């Protein structure tokens, strides 16, 4: 994995020694070359995971998250170079350094062979994200949002540190490859109940769980666009990745410890979709949609069937691409009307027809239109939760109805109807904006052709 | 002050610390603490204003009371052991009194009530000496007497220090009081792991001295004693805001920084001895320390507070201060976590 | 640096260069007292170094290439716009007065640094001990608010206490009508808008506060508009003073060493000029401060430390 | 009054000074070369060559091997009358049960 860590570190002298008009182009070009190179991780096998060294490995779960992570950096550089155009050159290089450094932390977060290295990288991903939100966020609430983002994650993760060091003292190792063969059953006791909570609540905060999601519609809203892209596309999926690793160790106690959290997520996907029906902020509507989509991934990890893991990793990749594109569409209107109020700019299909086509396709992937991998992940989670209990089909179907409702309500509100008369700075769509939309959508549609590379370790 | 007299008095401070660190006799331990206090009193009164005289008087009363309780513990040891070797104490009453005396010398809670007053009353260099160098000798004595330290006493002092140093810094806007309550919380972290593994105690003390030396050196180089005076640093020297950002993020215990190293090793050595509740409550309590550190980063580096007009004149002048070892201390306080197994050199 | 504690140890004591000619002299008077030529002639008879009165661009004269900067980088204030609209809305009055107080403080630090490093005396014009007469005149004329006077008194209280007062204060009695005659014969179209009550308040604060409070801590000399024309009578009065007042007598090598360590670090001299009292006449918001600071960096010879600018011709940087 | 602050700057239009703006920069040559870098290295390289690369993965996670091996095993144990799969994954001879 060192052949990806070293070029990501070499993006730092590439962004600090570049000419002052070349610091976006060079980082975009070489991060696209790293994203091209990311496809060598598809050397996967049906029995063995691609095990590089004592420190790094990549199974078929970490590999799509890695390719999505290394693909997200040039798109964040494209999205964030217009509103940081008038920035100081040094602060612009600091923003690009925080993006590169967050990618550097993530690509060795997902490949961490040993779990405390995963914890160090996992909590290292707070610091560039916190700096991006609280420094290049736009409104006043970015400082409070950075507080909530920091102090939910550390409140969840500092019991996780004690849990992992306890496993290190008991099993003798936190290597995940050794713990695939030295895993012992975790019986019913109060000690093992709080063991389960300490191993799971950090990732429940990072997904986010319903009831603990209150960091998210302030951190995802008050960030800039690159912060919103990385938070929606990768940093929620760190939680699901950690769950799919750490639920190896939590059996059979998960089979009754999962019930309150399965209730919280099965009811939170209804409640947050209902919240999306009544949002005035478009960016907050996309934030609560992200909570609504990650609730299904939480249920799919907690029921731990193979169909549920396949649907959960497919839905994680699909939601990363879809939510990143929805935030970029929201930014493309915010850079014209300078307001996140959804009812302000109306009738935009009369003005921006191809951008409205991108709105249509992202709203169709948001409502899980087949054969998109959105529908593949959605559908496999619904199959596995039906096999779990036959009455969960009511909640899954009601969630799908409300999901279609807020997706097409977002589309109709922003794009349809009579246009707003007093708004006259609606520029045509720039080539940068349409290129950003297509670089989100076209991989998301091409992955419907060959979807087996995003279905996890147990496809 | 005469620079010759300044150098001799700082050598006498260091001499008292070294006499505590090398000597095998309890009278020489007590002599070293006496010499240390007697020499550090002029450093606190370097500027001769009533707050420094008040701070030196409060420091004198606390360290004098602790030195007399130390000599009473030594005298009860001479009763119940007939000898003077600096090793374990042969009576639980002598052990209790000596642990109280060293808790007063360190300013651990509930003997903490002098540390923010005395640190506020004195300059930044003397506050640096008080919060870094004056922690060395009592931790050396605690390192030597640990076969007789009562566990419940030292852990009560430790968690009470961590909790009160967490809640104390949340109300503060003066930088020296923030550093003093940071001191109280970190001394709780040091003494909590002492009877479990004192090598991790020395690791916490070394990382703490590096980070506190970095923060006091940045506060000296910017001449900022309050939060709101530190807030003008972005319009004067913007690199200093970056350095105080990464050092405050380090002292909060965030990975991948080296201020995460001591608390992670302390949790690591306390779970080995079947203590789970205590390092978890200590780790959750350190989030308060991280909260007022993030308050300072918000006021300094992540936002731009309003400055005044006269800063334009200070743009035309460089820093002619001897920012001694400030890049070295900034690198060591942040980028040392890949070198975490270097701690074995303190074994 | 150049001078530190080590040079004090190795023999550089400052009373070895402190002769009887080493005196700090400050010449004072109203707006057109004509005391500039008096200060220059006193400085050339006594063999001293004359410092002109610090304006807006004094720091520009001591740093960089010595040429004045644009007013957006230095001052952000105008003496002419104070003369024209002394009750202006944008707060030019106290902002000009505060920048001038910092300029005179920088000048006084330069004066003490010259006096203590060379042993040559200094003649000054309207030092920081007399700067407050324009503050009190502008407050009595309603040109500034009371909170501006409170801000000035805070900055002065924490800055002027760290210095020694001058040896000789030379005040020049020029009445208001003669001052206005010289203003009208000067021909400055902005300066001819000065009201009589402002000049009267200057003279009143002078004669009622400055000289009665400086007469204890220093030796005041006082002259009319014609007996100050003869420079030799003034220099004769200076040379036959029995210097016995003020805190210059109890100054050994250690106190003057601490003072010389103070007056060479200019950011410590100018430390408390920008105290964080958010007074709206001098508080510059973050976007304007950021933009003006980034434009000040782009000025030639200002991007780095003074020895480290290739664009003005500094070589051997890779070995510095 | 309130303090000394710059007014809100008007939001710039990239199409006023450059009607051929691709939206990357206000310098037109930098803008066109950013357009070409983005379009070439994203679409012409990563999308096209990655669709080809994923399209021709060498038996990704050995599913085609497993189908061919299963055809071989079914073709074996149909000809010998063996059942196509045992309900026991492991041989019961090599399993010691806990006695009762």
């Amino acid at each position: 994995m060192l052949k990806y860590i070293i070029p990501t570190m070499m993006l730092m002298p590439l962004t600090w020694l570049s000419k002052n008009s070349m610091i976006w182009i060079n980082t975009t070009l070489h991060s696209l070359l790293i994203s091209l190179t990311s496809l060598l991780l598809l050397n996967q096998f049906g029995d063995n995971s691609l095990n590089f060294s004592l420190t790094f490995f990549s199974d078929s779960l970490s590999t799509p998250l890695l390719i999505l992570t290394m693909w997200l950096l040039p798109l964040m550089l494209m999205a964030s170079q217009h509103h940081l155009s008038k920035e100081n050159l040094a602060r612009k290089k600091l923003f690009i350094s925080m993006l590169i450094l967050l990618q550097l932390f993530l690509i060795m977060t997902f490949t961490a062979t040993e779990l405390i290295f995963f914890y160090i990288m996992f909590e290292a991903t707070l610091v560039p994200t916190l700096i991006i939100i609280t420094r290049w966020g736009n409104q006043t609430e970015r400082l409070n949002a950075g507080l909530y983002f920091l102090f939910y994650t550390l409140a969840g993760s500092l019991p996780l540190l004690v849990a992992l060091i306890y496993i290190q003292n008991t099993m003798g190792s936190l290597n995940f490859l050794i713990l695939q063969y030295w895993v012992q059953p975790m019986p019913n006791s109060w000690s093992n109940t709080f063991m389960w909570l300490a191993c799971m609540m950090a990732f429940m905060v990072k997904m986010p769980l319903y009831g603990l999601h209150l960091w998210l519609p302030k951190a995802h809203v008050e960030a800039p666009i690159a912060g919103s892209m990385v938070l929606a596309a990768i940093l929620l999926k760190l939680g699901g990745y950690g769950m799919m690793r750490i639920t190896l160790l939590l059996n059979p106690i998960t089979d009754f410890m999962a019930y309150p959290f399965i209730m919280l997520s099965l009811w939170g996907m209804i409640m947050t979709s209902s919240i999306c029906l009544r949002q005035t902020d478009l960016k907050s509507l996309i934030a609560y949609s992200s909570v609504s989509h990650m609730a299904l991934v939480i249920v799919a990890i907690l029921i731990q069937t193979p169909w549920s893991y396949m649907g959960a990793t497919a839905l994680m990749i699909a939601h990363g691409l879809t939510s990143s594109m929805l935030f970029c569409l929201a930014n493309s209107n915010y850079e014209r009307v300078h307001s996140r109020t959804m009812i302000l700019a109306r009738g935009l299909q009369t003005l921006l027809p191809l951008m409205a086509a991108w709105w249509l396709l992202a709203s169709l992937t948001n409502l899980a239109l087949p054969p998109s991998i959105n529908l593949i992940g959605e559908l496999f989670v619904v199959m596995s939760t039906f096999s779990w209990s036959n009455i969960t089909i009511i909640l899954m179907g009601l969630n799908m109805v409300i999901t279609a409702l807020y997706s097409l309500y977002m589309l109709i509100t922003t794009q349809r109807g009579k246009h707003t008369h007093h708004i006259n700075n609606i520029l045509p769509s720039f080539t940068r904006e349409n290129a950003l939309m297509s670089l989100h959508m076209l991989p998301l549609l091409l992955l419907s052709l060959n979807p087996k590379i995003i279905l996890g370790p147990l496809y | 002050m005469n620079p010759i007299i300044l150098i001799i008095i700082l050598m006498t401070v260091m001499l008292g610390t070294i006499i505590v660190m090398i000597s095998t006799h309890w009278l020489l331990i007590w002599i070293g603490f006496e010499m240390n206090m007697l020499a550090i009193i002029p450093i606190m009164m370097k500027k001769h204003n009533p707050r420094a005289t008040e701070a030196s008087t409060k420091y004198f009363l606390t360290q004098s009371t602790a030195s007399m309780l130390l000599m009473m513990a030594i005298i009860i040891n001479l009763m119940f052991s007939g000898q003077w070797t600096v090793m374990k104490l042969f009576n639980p009453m002598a052990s209790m009194l000596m642990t109280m005396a060293l808790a007063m010398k360190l300013g651990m809670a509930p003997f903490h009530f002098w540390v923010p007053e005395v640190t506020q009353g004195i300059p930044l260099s003397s506050g640096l000496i008080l919060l870094t160098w004056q922690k060395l000798a009592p931790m050396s004595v605690l390192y030597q007497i640990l076969p007789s330290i009562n566990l419940d006493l030292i852990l009560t002092l430790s968690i009470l220090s961590i909790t009160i140093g967490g809640w104390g810094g949340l109300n503060q806007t003066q930088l020296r009081k923030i550093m003093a309550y940071s001191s109280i919380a970190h001394m709780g972290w040091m003494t909590a792991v002492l009877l479990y593994n004192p090598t991790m105690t020395l690791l916490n003390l070394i990382i703490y001295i590096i980070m506190t030396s970095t923060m006091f050196t940045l506060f000296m180089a910017n001449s900022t004693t309050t939060t709101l005076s530190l807030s003008h640093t972005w319009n004067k020297a913007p690199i200093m805001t970056i350095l105080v950002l990464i050092t405050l993020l380090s002292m909060g215990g965030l990975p991948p920084l080296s201020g995460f190293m001591p608390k992670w090793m302390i949790i690591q050595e306390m779970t080995k001895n079947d203590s789970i509740i205590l390092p978890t409550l200590m780790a959750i309590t350190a989030l308060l320390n991280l909260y007022f550190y993030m308050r300072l980063t918000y006021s300094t580096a992540l936002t731009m507070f309003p400055s005044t007009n006269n800063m334009k004149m200070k743009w035309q002048f460089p820093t002619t201060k001897r920012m001694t070892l400030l890049p070295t201390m900034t690198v060591l306080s942040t980028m040392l976590l890949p070198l975490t197994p270097i701690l074995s050199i303190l074994e | 640096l150049q001078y530190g504690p080590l040079a004090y140890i190795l023999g550089e004591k400052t009373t070895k260069k402190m002769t009887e000619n080493s005196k700090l002299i400050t010449v004072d008077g109203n707006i057109c007292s004509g005391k500039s030529k008096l200060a220059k002639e006193v400085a050339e008879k006594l063999g001293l170094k004359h410092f002109p009165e610090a304006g807006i661009h004094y720091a520009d004269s001591t740093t960089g290439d010595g040429k004045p900067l644009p007013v957006r980088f230095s001052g952000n204030c105008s003496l002419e716009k104070f003369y024209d609209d002394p009750k202006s809305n944008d707060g030019n009055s106290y902002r000009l007065q505060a920048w001038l107080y910092a300029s005179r403080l920088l000048q006084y630090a330069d004066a003490l640094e010259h006096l203590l490093s060379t042993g040559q005396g200094v003649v000054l014009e309207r030092s920081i001990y007399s700067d407050f007469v324009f503050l009190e005149a502008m407050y009595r004329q309603g040109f500034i608010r009371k909170q501006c006077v409170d801000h000035y008194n805070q900055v002065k209280k924490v800055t002027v206490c760290e210095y020694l007062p001058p040896h000789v204060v030379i005040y020049v009695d020029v009445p208001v009508s003669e001052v206005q005659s010289r203003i009208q014969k000067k021909g400055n179209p902005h300066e001819m808008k000065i009201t009589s009550a402002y000049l009267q308040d200057i003279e009143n604060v002078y004669k009622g506060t400055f000289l009665p409070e400086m007469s204890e801590k220093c030796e005041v000399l006082q002259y009319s508009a014609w007996e100050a024309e003869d420079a030799e009578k003034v220099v004769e009065d200076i040379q036959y003073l029995k210097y016995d007042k003020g805190p210059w007598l109890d100054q050994d090598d250690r106190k003057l060493h601490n003072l010389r360590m103070l007056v060479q670090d200019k950011l410590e001299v100018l430390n408390y000029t920008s105290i964080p009292v958010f007074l709206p006449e001098v508080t510059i918001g973050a976007h304007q401060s950021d933009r003006v600071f980034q434009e000040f960096t782009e000025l030639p010879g200002r991007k780095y430390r003074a020895g480290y600018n290739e664009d003005v011709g500094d070589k051997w940087i890779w070995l510095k | 009054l309130r303090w000394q602050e710059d007014p809100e700057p008007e939001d710039e239009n990239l199409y006023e000074k450059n009607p051929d703006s691709h939206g990357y920069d206000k310098d037109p040559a930098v803008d066109v070369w950013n357009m070409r870098v983005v379009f070439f290295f994203g679409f012409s390289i990563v999308l096209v060559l990655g669709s080809t690369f994923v399209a021709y993965l060498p038996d990704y996670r050995m599913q085609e091997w497993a189908r061919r091996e299963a055809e071989r095993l079914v073709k074996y144990r149909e000809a010998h009358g063996l059942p196509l799969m045992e309900s026991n994954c492991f041989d019961p001879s090599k399993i010691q049960l806990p006695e009762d």
Binding site: R142 | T173, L228, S231, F305 | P276, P280 | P9
Partner: peptide, 19 residues
């Protein structure tokens, strides 16, 4: 439409004797 930076009312919250 530009980035919010703290005003005088925000920064007077950090200017007291305590917080």
């Amino acid at each position: 439409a530009r980035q919010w930076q703290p005003d005088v009312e925000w920064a007077e919250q950090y200017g007291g004797a305590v917080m």
